[PDB]
Amino acid sequence: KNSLALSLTADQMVSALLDAEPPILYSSMMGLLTNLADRELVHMINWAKRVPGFVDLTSHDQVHLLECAWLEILMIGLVWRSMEHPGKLLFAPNLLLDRNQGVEIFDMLLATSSRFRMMNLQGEEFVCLKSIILLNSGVYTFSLEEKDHIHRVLDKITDTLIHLMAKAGLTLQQQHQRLAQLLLILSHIRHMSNKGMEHLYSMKCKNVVPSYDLLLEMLDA
Amino acid sequence: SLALSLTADQMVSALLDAEPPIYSEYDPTRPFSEASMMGLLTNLADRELVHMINWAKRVPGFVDLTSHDQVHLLECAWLEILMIGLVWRSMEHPGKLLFAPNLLLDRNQGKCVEGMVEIFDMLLATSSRFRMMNLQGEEFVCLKSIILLNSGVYTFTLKSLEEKDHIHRVLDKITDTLIHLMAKAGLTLQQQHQRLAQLLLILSHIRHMSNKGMEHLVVPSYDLLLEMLDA
Ligand SMILES: COC(=O)/C=C/c1ccc(N(CC(F)(F)F)S(=O)(=O)[C@@H]2C[C@@H]3O[C@H]2C(c2ccc(O)cc2)=C3c2ccc(O)cc2)cc1
């Protein structure tokens, strides 16, 4: 493809993703969280359309990626928002919870926030990671041209991460180490998403996960 | 500990040397029932686990951890480790899963067990991805060791902070090792960072498959893992 996305510099990629960032939204615990997530989803769709390369995909492939990524995306945002509140999860500025208000999944989310803190994760890195989640989470479960495009965009995001690190003065060795540390946390975000989904099902909340058709209609709108 | 003093070459040699052996029951009644196929796979996994513990003990850094932390890591990783091994064995058999030399199954056979075809299809896609990437054996063994160290590190006092820090340093050494292998192969710096990312991103898919596998469902107990570690 002669795609605009593939011509982007590291700086343009960061700029696009920072510009696409949704606002931090305000708020029965499950009731509150469901209402918040539902409002977040609307923003997520519109954000996804702004991730470079995402709209080059067929509508079907866009929906597939969103279906596979949505809860991981919510989670990573939660973790980012909570990074400067040790021991707490900032679901919203008016819904900031500690463990006691929880717990298995709460504890996993808190450990991720601690990891982000210990690594001094930067906003520019965060937005790259969130975009990787969107592009990567569904890419192994899809056509050939689409997968190739996704992987080329993913490679651009890698290049962008490395450029950011090099600009901040990290040595080559530090760059590769940090890249790996950031990407390895994604496996834990996937794990938490799967546990979350298993828990949404266990609480009889199958209804609240967005369907293929819901996402499709939301993308078209 | 000297694990963190290893060179990239020594890390690769240690991991290659540590590799566990590769059979299923001879002449099982075929076709399989749901019960009989699950019986075969359970028997195979159970025997593989014993060799997995022996392998884990030889992953540089692993035995520096407390016994409790060793078991925690194995509890979190065991299914992913079995699955990556399966995917690796299956690379040169497009459309098939080489559970054992004598148990080579296609996706239609996954249908014999309720819920299993979906996991089979994900495993097959991973094998195709490894093939498309020309995954090398030296890379494979690094990735498998990453899984062991990474999967449970986020779900663990001064001691605990030192345990986590040690794990992360060993993970850093394996990263360095992967990069060295790539640089030695002649990849450009850009190509190196790209391939590293591509490989680590597949690990999130392996996680996913393990989680789904665990669900749809014979899981090894804390006590069994601990006994095997001590023996
Ligand atoms: C009646 O109220 C109750 O008793 C039940 C209370 C309760 C409350 C949360 C629980 N989880 C574990 C966590 F986050 F708490 F640690 S979670 O299921 O994995 C699930 C995941 C994550 O936390 C839940 C919630 C969610 C998502 C979609 C919905 O439609 C409704 C809720 C998430 C979320 C993350 C980021 C964000 O920006 C917005 C939402 C578990 C029991």
Swiss-Prot record, chain A:
<feature type="lipid moiety-binding region" description="S-palmitoyl cysteine">
    <location>
        <position position="128"/>
    </location>
</feature>
<protein>
    <recommendedName>
        <fullName>Estrogen receptor</fullName>
    </recommendedName>
</protein>
<comment type="subunit">
    <text>Binds DNA as a homodimer. Can form a heterodimer with ESR2. Interacts with FOXC2, MAP1S, SLC30A9, UBE1C and NCOA3 coactivator. Interacts with PELP1, the interaction is enhanced by 17-beta-estradiol, the interaction increases ESR1 transcriptional activity. Interacts with EP300; the interaction is estrogen-dependent and enhanced by CITED1. Interacts with CITED1; the interaction is estrogen-dependent. Interacts with NCOA5 and NCOA6 coactivators. Interacts with NCOA7; the interaction is a ligand-inducible. Interacts with PHB2, and UBE1C. Interacts with AKAP13. Interacts with CUEDC2.</text>
</comment>
<feature type="region of interest" description="Interaction with AKAP13">
    <location>
        <begin position="1"/>
        <end position="221"/>
    </location>
</feature>
<comment type="similarity">
    <text>Belongs to the nuclear hormone receptor family. NR3 subfamily.</text>
</comment>
<feature type="modified residue" description="Phosphotyrosine; by Tyr-kinases">
    <location>
        <position position="212"/>
    </location>
</feature>
<feature type="binding site">
    <location>
        <position position="199"/>
    </location>
    <ligand>
        <name>17beta-estradiol</name>
    </ligand>
</feature>
<feature type="region of interest" description="Self-association">
    <location>
        <begin position="1"/>
        <end position="221"/>
    </location>
</feature>
<feature type="domain" description="NR LBD">
    <location>
        <begin position="9"/>
        <end position="221"/>
    </location>
</feature>
<comment type="function">
    <text>Nuclear hormone receptor. The steroid hormones and their receptors are involved in the regulation of eukaryotic gene expression and affect cellular proliferation and differentiation in target tissues. Ligand-dependent nuclear transactivation involves either direct homodimer binding to a palindromic estrogen response element (ERE) sequence or association with other DNA-binding transcription factors, such as AP-1/c-Jun, c-Fos, ATF-2, Sp1 and Sp3, to mediate ERE-independent signaling.</text>
</comment>
<feature type="region of interest" description="Transactivation AF-2">
    <location>
        <begin position="9"/>
        <end position="221"/>
    </location>
</feature>
<feature type="binding site">
    <location>
        <position position="40"/>
    </location>
    <ligand>
        <name>17beta-estradiol</name>
    </ligand>
</feature>
<feature type="binding site">
    <location>
        <position position="81"/>
    </location>
    <ligand>
        <name>17beta-estradiol</name>
    </ligand>
</feature>
